[PDB]
Scaffold this motif. Structure first.
Motif, short mmCIF file in Angstrom:
data_model
loop_
_atom_site.label_atom_id
_atom_site.label_comp_id
_atom_site.label_asym_id
_atom_site.label_seq_id
_atom_site.Cartn_x
_atom_site.Cartn_y
_atom_site.Cartn_z
N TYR A 89 17.02 51.99 63.65
CA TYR A 89 15.82 52.32 62.89
C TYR A 89 15.12 51.07 62.39
O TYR A 89 15.68 49.98 62.47
N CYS A 94 20.95 49.64 61.81
CA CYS A 94 21.73 50.65 62.51
C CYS A 94 22.37 51.55 61.44
O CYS A 94 22.97 51.02 60.52
N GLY A 98 23.49 49.04 57.84
CA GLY A 98 22.42 48.27 57.20
C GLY A 98 21.52 47.55 58.20
O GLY A 98 21.44 47.92 59.38
#
Ligand SMILES: [Cl-]
Ligand SMILES: [Cl-]
Ligand SMILES: [Gd]
Ligand SMILES: [Gd]
Ligand SMILES: [Gd]
Ligand SMILES: [Gd]
Ligand SMILES: [Gd]
Ligand SMILES: [Gd]
Ligand SMILES: [Gd]
Ligand SMILES: [Gd]
Ligand SMILES: [Gd]
Ligand SMILES: [Gd]
Ligand SMILES: [Gd]
Ligand SMILES: [Gd]
Length: 258
Positions: A89, A94, A98
């Motif tokens: 993201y 991940c 983090g």
């Protein structure tokens, strides 16, 4: 009549009866492919045979687990771990790790592809072997998704020539599954091709797979005539034979009448 009439207009897929020592699994050849080259693997000629004009990196034999699921590293606060693509993201992190400090857009070295140490971010590979149908009938091969580009070919003179598994690739672009990455855009998921196969004949099978950046994905399945599905692990179905270009009776052009 005393005999079957044969598939209409010689339509049966060519198969083989190699007489040599059978080995479990497929051979995987690895060829150089450039990081971020999103055009080379869009050509049918490259995916059918052109890949072998590039540097051969190495090979591994006897592979029965043939699906590809390569995840790039996330260099995280707690160490370096592979990130499932759907868990990536932002720019970027991940899920559960983090923020990641490393680039998505560089080459990464890993043995994830069949234990061979290479760059799964950017590579082309060729899987060859013979598929042994235990049942006569229609078989439907499928790629659940393709990241980035792939083909699957079944049959003598389509995948390769009988008793000649180890030879340079043949020129046929008559793919069983065409998962070639389009010049603009993406292919649907679950791309498929069907082959009618006669039990106990060996059908040449070629898969050519390429990735240019980061994640690589190729989940391979086959649906059997009995309606069941074999995914990833093709043990019991795929075999290799050393070349024997002298075995005169090796090619069966029409298994429906042999
Ligand atoms: Cl990793
Ligand atoms: Cl997170
Ligand atoms: Gd696997
Ligand atoms: Gd495995
Ligand atoms: Gd993997
Ligand atoms: Gd995945
Ligand atoms: Gd692996
Ligand atoms: Gd793995
Ligand atoms: Gd694996
Ligand atoms: Gd041929
Ligand atoms: Gd990719
Ligand atoms: Gd079915
Ligand atoms: Gd696995
Ligand atoms: Gd050989």
């Amino acid at each position: 009549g005393l005999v079957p009439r044969g598939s209409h207009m010689s339509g049966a897929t060519e198969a083989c009866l190699p007489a040599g020592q059978r080995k479990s699994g497929m051979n995987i050849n690895f060829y150089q492919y450039s990081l971020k080259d999103s055009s080379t693997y869009s050509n049918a000629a490259y995916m059918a045979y052109g890949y072998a004009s590039k540097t051969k990196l190495g090979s591994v034999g006897g592979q029965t687990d043939i699906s590809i699921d390569y995840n790039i590293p996330c260099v995280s606060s707690s160490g370096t771990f592979p990130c499932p693509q759907e868990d990536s993201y932002g720019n970027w992190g991940c899920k559960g790790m983090g923020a990641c400090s490393n680039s998505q857009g560089i080459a990464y070295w890993s043995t994830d592809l069949f234990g061979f140490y290479t760059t799964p971010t950017n590579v082309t590979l060729e899987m060859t072997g013979y598929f042994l149908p235990p049942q006569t009938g229609s078989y439907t091969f499928s790629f659940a998704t393709v990241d980035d580009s792939a083909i699957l070919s079944v049959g003598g003179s389509i995948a390769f020539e009988c008793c000649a598994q180890e030879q340079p690739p043949i020129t046929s672009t008559n793919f069983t599954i065409n998962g070639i990455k389009p010049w603009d855009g993406s292919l649907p998921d679950n791309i498929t091709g069907t082959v009618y196969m006669y039990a106990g004949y060996y059908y040449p099978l070629k898969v050519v797979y390429s990735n240019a950046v980061s994640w690589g994905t190729l989940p391979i399945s086959v649906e059997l005539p009995d309606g069941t599905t074999v995914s990833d692990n093709f043990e019991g179905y795929v075999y290799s034979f050393d070349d024997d270009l002298s075995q005169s009776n090796c090619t069966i052009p029409d298994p429906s009448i042999h």
